[PDB]
Amino acid sequence: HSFSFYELKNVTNNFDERPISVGGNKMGEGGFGVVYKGYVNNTTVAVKKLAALKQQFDQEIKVMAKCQHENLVELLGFSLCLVYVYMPNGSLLDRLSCLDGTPPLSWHMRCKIAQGAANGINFLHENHHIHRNIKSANILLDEAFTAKISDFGLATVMTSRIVGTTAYMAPEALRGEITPKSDIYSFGVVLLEIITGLPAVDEHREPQLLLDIKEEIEDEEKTIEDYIDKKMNDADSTSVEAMYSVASQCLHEKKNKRPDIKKVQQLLQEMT
Amino acid sequence: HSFSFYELKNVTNNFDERPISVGGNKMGEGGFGVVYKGYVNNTTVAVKKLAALKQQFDQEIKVMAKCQHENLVELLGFSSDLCLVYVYMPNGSLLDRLSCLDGTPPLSWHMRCKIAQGAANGINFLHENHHIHRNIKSANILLDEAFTAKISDFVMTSRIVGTTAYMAPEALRGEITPKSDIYSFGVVLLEIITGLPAVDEHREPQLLLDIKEEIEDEEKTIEDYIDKKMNDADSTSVEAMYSVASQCLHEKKNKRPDIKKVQQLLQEMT
Provide the residue ranges of all domains of chain B, joining segments of one domain with +: 1-88, 89-270
**Interface contact B205, partner A, CB < 8 A:** yes
Rounded to a whole number, what is the distance in Å from the CA of A240 to chain B's nearest CA?
25
**Which residues in chain B are closer than 8 Å to A162, comparing Cβ atoms?**
159-161, 164
**Interface contact A33, partner B, CB < 8 A:** no
For residues A160 and A176, the answer to whether their CB atoms sit within 8 Å is yes
B157–A30 C-beta distance less than 8 A: yes
Distance CA A223, CA A221 (A): 7
H-only helix segments in chain A: 5-11, 54-66, 92-96, 107-126, 171-174, 180-196, 213-218, 224-227, 237-250, 261-269
Class of domain B89-270: mainly alpha
**Interface contact A19, partner B, CB < 8 A:** no
For residues B208 and B198, the answer to whether their CB atoms sit within 8 Å is yes
**Interface contact B218, partner A, CB < 8 A:** no
CA distances from B52 to A137, B9, B31, B197 (A): 38, 18, 12, 30
Among chain B residues, the shortest Cα distance to A255 is held by B213
**Which residues in chain B are closer than 8 Å to A169, comparing Cβ atoms?**
173
DSSP 8-state secondary structure symbol assigned to residue A25? S
Name the residue facing B251 among A161, A164, A253 (closest C-beta): A253
For residues A155 and A63, the answer to whether their CB atoms sit within 8 Å is yes
SS3 B182: helix
**Interface contact B176, partner A, CB < 8 A:** no
Hey, what CATH topology would domain A87-272 get? Transferase(Phosphotransferase); domain 1 (1.10.510)
- In what helix (H) or strand (E) does residue A178 lie, and over which residues does it extend? none
Hey, what CATH topology would domain A1-86 get? Phosphorylase Kinase; domain 1 (3.30.200)
B157–A162 C-beta distance less than 8 A: no
Distance CA B210, CA B225 (A): 12
Experimental method: X-ray
Of the residues B159, B164, B167, B173, the best mutation for testing chain A's interface (the one with the most A CB atoms within 10 Å of its CB) is B173
**Interface contact A155, partner B, CB < 8 A:** no
Classify the C-alpha dihedral A226-A228-A232-A237 as positive or negative: negative
A171–B251 C-beta distance less than 8 A: yes
* Residues near B268 by beta carbon (within 8 Å), at least 6 away in sequence: B240
Resolution (Å units)? 2.8
- What DSSP string describes B218-254? TS--GGGGS-TT-S---HHHHHHHHHHHHHHT-SSTT
Name the residue facing A165 among B157, B161, B175 (closest C-beta): B157
Q: Which is the CATH superfamily of the domain at B1-88? A: Phosphorylase Kinase; domain 1 (3.30.200.20)
A166–B160 C-beta distance less than 8 A: yes
For residues A83 and A77, the answer to whether their CB atoms sit within 8 Å is yes
Distance CA B187, CA B182 (A): 9
For residues A104 and A116, the answer to whether their CB atoms sit within 8 Å is no
Distance CA A105, CA B184 (A): 43
In degrees and rounded to multiples of 5, residue A131 shows phi and psi of -70, -45
The number of beta carbons lying within 10 Å of the beta carbon of residue B198 is: 22
